[PDB]
A paper describes a structure:
Two homologous exotoxins, toxin A (TcdA) and B (TcdB), are the key virulence factors of C. difficile, leading to C. difficile infections (CDI) with variable clinical features including life-threatening pseudomembranous colitis. Most of these toxins are composed of four structural modules: an N-terminal glucosyltransferase domain (GTD), followed by a cysteine protease domain (CPD), a delivery and receptor-binding domain (DRBD), and a large C-terminal combined repetitive oligopeptides domain (CROPs). Triggered by acidification in the endosomes, the hydrophobic pore-forming region of the toxin undergoes membrane insertion and facilitates the translocation of the GTD and the CPD into the cytosol. The GTD then glucosylates and inactivates the Rho and/or Ras families of small guanosine triphosphatases (GTPases) in host cells, resulting in depolymerization of the actin cytoskeleton, cell rounding, and ultimately cell death.
Numbering used by the authors: 857 to 974, 980 to 1660, 1669 to 2481
Write the structure that this text describes.
């Protein structure tokens, strides 16, 4: 030890110089593990303690690398003695191998000394090195700057025990499981509840401690309570009342037609009536669907609304308002560039002083929004009155001239389309200290959902949140003491939306596979919760919960900061156990990996149940109280293994390591409140319990030591420990007096003295010895480790002398090796107290010579000099006090080591005795008597040694083993006073063993001892009673029983009965007990082949159940009653009847346990009533009795019996009432049955079929008074007509009878009509919840086309129902107003414009027509970009020829009307139909002519089929009469036809001639024609010099003529 004391100062000196030489501060730490050598130069790492940065310094001196392999070799030894740390708690790995024990002690004792200083710089480097190794991956591998600074901080600023011990002083019961020292750790977790401890104990070593804290109890209760409330609701998804946007053309459209839009506003006006929150189910407040709530303030009892606006209007002219119908001249137009209009400001939504008394609330589902809209031409709407139209009006009126939703310009328009544009909404929820339950909405259009955001402000209460299947970003600001519950039922179950309502379904595989847990972010499946606020609170637990069953709830327990989660199940105890197999598999399906589950449940009657379940093997421990008794139930997988109905322990704790259970507590021995033993117990089998530790308080250990000291040398093997448990009556802890208490390796007993405590432990040999012990007197500290022999070492404690006494050694003296007294420099007194004569062994005392000597050294013995005798052994002085005058012989040996080696130290010694003082070693040698210590068997040999023809065994520490001990799985005995191997017969405290006369081993099983027969168990103890050998079962009996036998020898017993204190045996002729079946005195007996005892009570010998009389042990036959159940055993063969059977004229039934049945059961013989006793005649119990033509009510079901006492099945009439008995059970039916199409109802308390009119819990039915059958279809009930649907429900509406549709009207609608009875309704409308009918003369509803008050309608001839909106009836589309009234013209449908020609019964048609924006080409389908049928299409700058007409269309795709010239041609288009004009046309006075094919205005000369006209090139008018063109003159008819002949112009009659008449003239040109006759058309003319025709009387070439002065024609 001084060898290292020099080495340390050697290596810290050089370390000191190496530091100054590279100018290294006291803040730099050498790092011995990483030193490299490369070609004669060592490179040595130094870590800067402050910032964790590294520096490497070169050296030549090899002391550092040399001393590093010294010390790292010893730290490894220590690191292998420790399993891990759980939150800084180091968990020891207990080693029972003696060389492991002795190696880790030396390493521990070494390193623990270097740490323990105040030079310190080399010391704190060793401590840091060790720390970085036990708690981390080794200093040599850490290179993170921060991680190192924190490691090194922890290493210096705390303190680590690394010396072997188990309790380490703590006065508790130690649990060593799988070789790990868990006991101390689990106490702290249960004491102060560290989140970090709890997590690492579960993760690193598999430990689940369970917490019966009444707080946690309450919490789990309130969580499961919340889950039982919130999950039961059938709520709808978001928007089934407001609407769900459609995505047409990449923008979203909430509503698309006028009526729908008006109705959405109608919906919103419910905020007026019901405030922001309707209370559906009297249990939960629900926000008005799509109402934008942007803050909910629970302190203020107030709401904040978000923004919900609609676009503005601007402009317009001539606003008149007549009959609340806005009329215009210039219609306004919507603008997105003017401020938009708040819809809610028109609504008086009261948003303050709200009744937040209900605890469950659905969150808002509406982000803010600005509504874009559109106007359209829709007819009929002028008579519309809703709370919808009333709201829209209010918006109009709140914001005059900026919003008009239904007006008139030159056609009546209206709001047509509602396009929302959503903006991110953040909804703050400001909580109170109260308790609040929140349900997230299921929002289906993604575009809406990703604008919503929840933000909670915690305030100390309990808050739940029901996650939806489709996530919404939520954020929780944590307060200090608030409790957050997340029920994840929808996130962890397959979801389904059936008619838009949310039903939960299957459990979804592997959802909880990954749970990302982070200081401020949890990820459960698809949902992400973000946390802010008090997010470093190490103590908070957040809870995840869900419902696995009707009655079983799962709670996932999450610590955000310790990034860890744990499992826990709550529910009825007896239920969970019955379904433990099944509800575990649900956990695995979730993909939860946790290997242990805690049980924590509180019933309706307020009794707490606690427990823990191993997932992997389904072993469970349950603890609870009942009538103040302590209950413990251990279940193996739903079947009950161990059950203690009164556990007599205080301070109970329960925990699980992997699948091992441990229960610890205090037990008061003999119920003395002053005698507390502390226990650690693992339940294993029904009648077997494992003890893995006992801590004895001061009183019990002293009683225990007494028991050890009177062990008779039976103080060593594990079975010795069983005999202690016996002596202290420990079975009383449980109640069962024969429990197998299992004492096995790693068992610890640790008792407490008034000076310290000793720790004992079990070997790999199943032997018990001192492991560690320590006690302190006022002045001197006595220590003992199994790893250094089992020597007691006496050292001084500070706060000058060394006291020693034999008294602390009382009882444990057996196990002690030697007492080594070890003085230091500063001890000049060693007091030795020899006058103590109560022990059985007095270990040699060795005074260890201080190697460094001391100024003086003085021993003080309190005995008299004459009792002593000195001796010399080498350089050792010896004193021996021999007390022989008593009856026991005490021999106290004292040896001063090596004091003969130093002639100086030898004369320093003074011993002083009781009667003589200040004596010297010299004096004692010169005057005391001497002796010669020749201890041949105080050798140093390990094993079986053999000395002076006697055999000794030497144990692990090379001591001499004494007593009854296990060696090499064999049992031996060494004399308690002489220690040699004993052979042959030994008594050990009442109980006789026997050890082989050749090998020493105690006898096992059955052997022959010098002519006798002897039976020793596996512990070797001699047994009394009956036991089996290779000749049979003998009776190894007490002494003096049959011819003065010695104990346990098989004796003679033949053909006689033996009853060994409560049993029965029979011995045959050959004196060997009898087994099998055996007939004795003509009477049957069964003796078990395993132990030769007579069976008593019910028994099963080879799948055959017999009853043996409990007193006489003989068979019993016939009827019998055992434990209040009747049985039948065969009168011949005694086998017990099971199944159907017959017995001397009676039917009987017995279920699988051969117990009589009672009731109605089906056999191959019928359905028979196996009846109770004294029911009919004095019938036997269970006898099928005659029950003739009667009804049987079996306190339960109902049966009818026919004449041969058998139950009836099927449909059966009995005494005018109909019944329906089950085919398989024979029992009456109840409720709805359908017996071959026919549907019945059987009254649940009498089973009779219902007859007549009936109200069955919600609706009305009629059951035919003769056949009990439900009514279906049109149906007559005593002359009055009624209607009933497919399931027979009476309907109230309009339905098809054989005489048309009839108003099956409610009660009191015409002259006290009965509800549901058809009535008279003559010449009137009927508007019945949306559907609208008209009833004609006969008060039968009219179908088909029909006009009333000059408004045509159309009632669907399949339901009598008026038509609304666009409709297809007989291949033609019509448009009906909101009230069924047919309309015509320009109607806008879904943002397109169509035409419904009023000249075609208003059929929608394709053509060119006038809409209030122009003439538009209502094209057929697929004419421009896959357009719709009859939709106005774009058609720009093109002509169009259609069905033999011709139009032309301008830039704005609208026809053109009137006089038009289009790219070099003139056209005229009908002011009334935009049709091209074709053919002869008198237009606005002038007469024109347009081409028949191309409708072009004709210009110039044209021949219109038979006649030539000339149309003026300037004005396109057909010219008439004397018309000069191109100089030349022509003459045309009144109707524009060219003429050829003589005609009058301004200058007179000219000749308008054929072509080439004169001077190559063109046809019809007036020509020169001089002094010539011209005779055409029979008429004769003369032309003069002026080429003009002549009138009057004239004289032409001799002849006279008279020419008509009117026509210039010759009339002569």
């Amino acid at each position: 030890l001084i060898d290292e004391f020099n080495l340390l100062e050697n290596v810290s000196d050089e370390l000191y110089e190496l530091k100054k030489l590279n100018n290294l501060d006291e803040k730099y730490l050498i790092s011995f593990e990483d030193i490299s050598k490369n070609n004669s130069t060592y490179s040595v790492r130094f870590i800067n303690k402050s910032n964790g940065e590294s520096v490497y310094v070169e050296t030549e001196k090899e002391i550092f690398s040399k001393y590093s392999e010294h010390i790292t070799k010893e730290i490894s030894t220590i690191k292998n003695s420790i399993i891990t740390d759980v939150n800084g708690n180091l968990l020891d790995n207990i080693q029972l191998d003696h060389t492991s024990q002795v190696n880790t002690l030396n390493a521990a004792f070494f390193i623990q000394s270097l740490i323990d200083y105040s030079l310190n710089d080399l010391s704190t480097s060793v401590k840091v090195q060790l720390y970085a190794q036990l708690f981390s991956t080794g200093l040599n591998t850490i290179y993170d700057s921060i991680q190192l600074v924190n490691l090194i901080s922890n290493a210096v600023n705390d303190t680590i025990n690394v010396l072997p011990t188990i309790t380490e002083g703590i006065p508790i019961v130690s649990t060593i499981l799988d070789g790990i020292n868990l006991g101390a750790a689990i106490k702290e977790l249960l004491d102060e509840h560290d989140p970090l401890l709890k997590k690492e104990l579960e993760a690193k070593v598999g430990v689940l401690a369970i917490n019966m804290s009444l707080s946690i109890a309450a919490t789990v209760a309130s969580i499961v309570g919340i889950g039982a409330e919130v999950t039961i609701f059938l709520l709808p998804i978001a928007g089934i009342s407001a609407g769900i946007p459609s995505l047409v053309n990449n923008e979203l459209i909430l509503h698309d037609k006028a009526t729908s839009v008006v109705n959405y506003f109608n919906h919103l006006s419910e905020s007026k009536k019901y405030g922001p929150l309707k209370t559906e189910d009297d249990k939960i407040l629900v926000p008005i669907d799509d109402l934008v709530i942007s803050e909910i303030d629970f302190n203020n009892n107030s709401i904040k609304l978000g923004t919900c606006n609609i676009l503005a209007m601007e402009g317009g002219s001539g606003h008149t308002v007549t009959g609340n119908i806005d009329h215009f001249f210039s219609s306004p137009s919507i603008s997105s560039h003017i401020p938009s209009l708040s819809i809610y400001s028109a609504i008086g939504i009261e948003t303050e002083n709200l009744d937040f008394s209900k605890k469950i609330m659905m969150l808002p589902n509406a982000p803010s929004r600005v509504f874009w809209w559109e106007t359209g031409a829709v007819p009929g709407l002028r008579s519309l009155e809703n709370d919808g139209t009333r709201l829209l009006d209010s918006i109009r009126d709140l914001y005059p001239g900026k919003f008009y939703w239904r007006f008139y310009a030159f056609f009546d328009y209206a709001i047509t389309t509602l396009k929302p544009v959503y903006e991110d909404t953040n909804i703050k929820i400001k909580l109170d200290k109260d308790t609040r339950n929140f349900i997230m909405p299921t929002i289906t259009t993604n575009e809406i959902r990703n604008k919503l955001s929840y933000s909670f402000d915690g305030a100390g209460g309990t808050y739940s949140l029901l996650l939806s299947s489709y996530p919404i970003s939520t954020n929780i600001n944590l307060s200090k003491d608030d409790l957050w519950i997340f029920n994840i039922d929808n996130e962890v179950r397959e979801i389904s939306i059936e008619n838009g309502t949310i039903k939960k379904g299957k459990l979804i595989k592997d959802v909880l596979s990954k749970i990302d847990i982070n200081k401020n972010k949890l990820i459960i499946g698809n949902q992400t919760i973000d946390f802010s606020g008090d997010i470093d609170n190490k103590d908070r637990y957040i809870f995840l919960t869900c419902e696995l069953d009707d009655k079983i709830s799962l709670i996932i327990e999450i610590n955000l900061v310790a990034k860890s989660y744990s499992l826990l199940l709550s529910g009825d105890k007896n239920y969970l156990i019955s379904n433990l197999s099944n509800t575990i598999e649900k956990i695995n399906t979730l993909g939860l990996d946790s290997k242990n589950i805690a049980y924590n449940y509180t019933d309706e009657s307020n009794n707490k149940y606690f427990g823990a379940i191993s997932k992997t093997s389904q072993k469970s421990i349950i603890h609870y109280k009942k009538d103040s008794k302590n209950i413990l139930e251990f279940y193996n997988d739903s079947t009950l293994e161990f059950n203690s109905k009164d556990f007599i322990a205080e301070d109970i704790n329960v925990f699980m390591k992997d699948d091992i259970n441990t229960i610890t507590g205090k037990y008061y021995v003999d119920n003395n409140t002053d005698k507390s033993i502390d226990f650690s117990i693992s339940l294993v089998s029904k009648n077997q319990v494992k003890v893995n530790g006992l801590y004895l308080n001061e009183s019990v250990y002293s009683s225990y030591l007494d028991f050890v000291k009177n062990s008779d040398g039976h103080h060593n093997t594990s079975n010795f420990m069983n005999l202690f448990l016996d002596n202290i009556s420990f079975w009383k802890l449980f109640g069962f007096e024969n429990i197998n208490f299992v004492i096995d390796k790693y068992f610890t007993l640790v008792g407490k003295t008034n000076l310290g405590y000793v720790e004992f432990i079990c070997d790999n040999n199943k032997n018990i010895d001192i492991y560690f012990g320590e006690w302190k007197t006022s002045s001197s500290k006595s220590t003992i480790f199994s790893g250094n022999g089992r020597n007691v070492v006496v050292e001084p404690i500070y706060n000058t002398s060394l006291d020693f006494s034999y008294e602390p050694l009382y009882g444990i003296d057996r196990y002690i090796n030697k007492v080594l007294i070890a003085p230091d420099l500063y001890t000049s007194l060693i007091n030795i107290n020899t006058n103590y004569y109560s022990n059985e062994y007095y270990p040699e005392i060795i005074v260890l010579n201080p190697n460094t000597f001391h100024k003086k050294v003085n021993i003080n013995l309190d005995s008299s000099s004459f009792e002593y005798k000195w001796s010399t052994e080498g350089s050792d002085f010896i004193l021996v006090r021999y007390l022989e005058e008593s009856n026991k012989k005490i021999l106290q040996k004292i040896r001063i080591k090596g004091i003969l080696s130093n002639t100086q130290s030898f004369n320093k010694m003074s011993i002083d005795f009781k009667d003589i003082k200040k004596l010297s070693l010299g004096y004692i040698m010169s005057n005391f008597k001497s002796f010669n210590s020749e201890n041949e068997l105080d050798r140093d040999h390990l094993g079986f040694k053999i000395i002076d023809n006697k055999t000794y065994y030497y144990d692990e520490d090379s001591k001499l083993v004494k007593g009854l001990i296990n060696i090499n799985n064999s049992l031996f005995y060494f004399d308690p006073i002489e220690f040699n191997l004993v052979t042959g017969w030994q008594t050990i405290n009442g109980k006789k063993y026997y050890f082989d006369i050749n090998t020493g081993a105690a006898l096992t099983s059955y052997k022959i001892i010098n002519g006798k027969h002897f039976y020793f168990n596996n512990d070797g103890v001699m047994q009394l009673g009956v036991f089996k050998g290779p000749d049979g079962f003998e009776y190894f009996a007490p002494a003096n029983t049959q011819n003065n036998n010695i104990e346990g020898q098989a004796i003679v017993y033949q053909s006689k009965f033996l009853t060994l204190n409560g049993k029965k045996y029979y011995f045959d002729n050959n004196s060997k007990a009898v087994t099998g079946w055996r007939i004795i005195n003509n009477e049957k007996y069964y003796f078990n082949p395993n132990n030769a005892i007579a069976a008593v009570g019910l028994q099963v010998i080879d799948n055959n159940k017999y009853y043996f009389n409990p007193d006489t042990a003989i068979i019993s036959k016939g009827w019998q009653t055992v434990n209040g159940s009747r049985y039948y055993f065969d009168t011949d063969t005694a086998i017990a009847f099971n199944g159907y059977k017959t017995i001397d004229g009676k039917h009987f039934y017995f279920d699988s346990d051969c117990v009589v049945k009672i009731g109605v059961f089906s056999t191959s013989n019928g359905f028979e009533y196996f009846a109770p006793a004294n029911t009919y005649n004095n019938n036997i119990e269970g006898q099928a009795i005659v029950y003739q033509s009667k009804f049987l009510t079996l306190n339960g079901k109902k049966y009818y019996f026919d004449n041969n006492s058998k139950a009836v099945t099927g449909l059966q009439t009995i005494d005018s009432k109909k019944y329906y008995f089950n085919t398989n059970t024979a029992e009456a039916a109840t409720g709805w049955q359908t017996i071959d199409g026919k549907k019945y109802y059987f009254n649940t308390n009498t089973a009779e079929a219902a007859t007549g009119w009936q109200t069955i819990d919600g609706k009305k039915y009629y059951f035919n008074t003769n056949t009990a059958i439900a009514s279906t279809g049109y149906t007559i009930i005593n002359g009055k007509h009624f209607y009933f649907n497919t399931d027979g429900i009476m309907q109230i509406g309009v339905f098809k009878g054989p005489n048309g549709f009839e108003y099956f009207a409610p009660a009191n609608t015409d002259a006290n009509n009965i509800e549901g009875q058809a009535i008279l309704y003559q010449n009137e409308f009927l508007t019945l919840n949306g559907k609208k009918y008209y009833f004609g003369s006969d008060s039968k509803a009219v179908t088909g086309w029909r006009i009333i008050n000059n408004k045509k309608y159309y009632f669907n001839p399949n339901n009598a129902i008026a038509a609304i909106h666009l409709c297809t009836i007989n291949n033609d589309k019509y448009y009906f107003s909101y009230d069924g009234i047919l309309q015509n013209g320009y109607i806008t449908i879904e943002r397109n414009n169509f035409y419904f020609d009023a000249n075609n019964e208003s059929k929608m048609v394709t053509g060119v027509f006038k809409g209030p924006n122009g003439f538009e080409y209502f094209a057929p389908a697929n004419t421009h970009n896959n357009n719709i049928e009859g939709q106005a299409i774009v058609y720009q700058n093109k002509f169009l020829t259609l069905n033999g007409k011709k139009y032309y269309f301008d830039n704005d795709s609208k026809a053109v009307t009137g006089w038009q010239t289009i790219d070099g041609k003139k056209y005229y288009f009908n002011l009334n139909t935009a049709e091209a004009a074709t053919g002869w046309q008198t237009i606005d006075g002038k007469k024109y002519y347009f081409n028949l094919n191309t409708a072009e205005a004709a210009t110039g000369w044209q021949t219109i089929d038979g006649k030539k006209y000339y149309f003026n090139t300037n004005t396109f008018i057909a010219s008439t009469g004397y018309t000069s063109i191109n100089g030349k003159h022509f003459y045309f008819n009144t109707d524009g036809i060219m003429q050829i002949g003589v005609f009058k112009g301004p200058n007179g009659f000219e000749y308008f001639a054929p072509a080439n008449t004169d001077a190559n003239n063109i046809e019809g040109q007036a020509i020169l024609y001089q002094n010539k006759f011209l005779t055409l058309n029979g008429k004769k003319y003369y032309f003069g010099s002026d080429s003009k025709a002549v009138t009057g009387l004239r004289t032409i070439d001799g002849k006279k003529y008279y020419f008509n002065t009117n026509t210039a024609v010759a009339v002569t």
